[PDB]
Amino acid sequence: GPLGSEKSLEQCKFGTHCTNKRCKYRHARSHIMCREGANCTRIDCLFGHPINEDCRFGVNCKNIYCLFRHPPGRVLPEKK
């Protein structure tokens, strides 16, 4: 069905911190990281979807739904 001004399937950089409500890209507003990741076709997703960028924390980062890429051998917590 119909959609607003956010029809770009790429993501914004600032996630939860993006300040514009009409902004053109997908935004991670929720703590859920997406099942389809960057191959996801959903404009309606509030979930974490990746961006081609290097994270500010790398191996020190513990954000499950983070916007930027992380190095090999990095660990993240789970409850499973």
Judged by the rule CB under 5 A, the positions of this chain that interact with Zn ion are 12, 18, 23, 34, 40, 42, 45, 47, 55, 61, 66
Centroid of chain to Cα 40? 11
Instruction: State in angstroms the smallest separation of the CB of 62 from Zn ion.
Output: 8
In angstroms, what is the C-alpha Rg of the chain?
13
Instruction: State in angstroms the smallest separation of the CB of 2 from Zn ion.
Output: 19
Between residues 56 and 80, which has the closer beta carbon with respect to Zn ion?
A: 56
Between residues 22 and 79, which has the closer beta carbon with respect to Zn ion?
A: 22
Q: Which residues contact 43 (CB under 8 A, 6 or more apart)?
A: 3, 6, 7, 9, 26
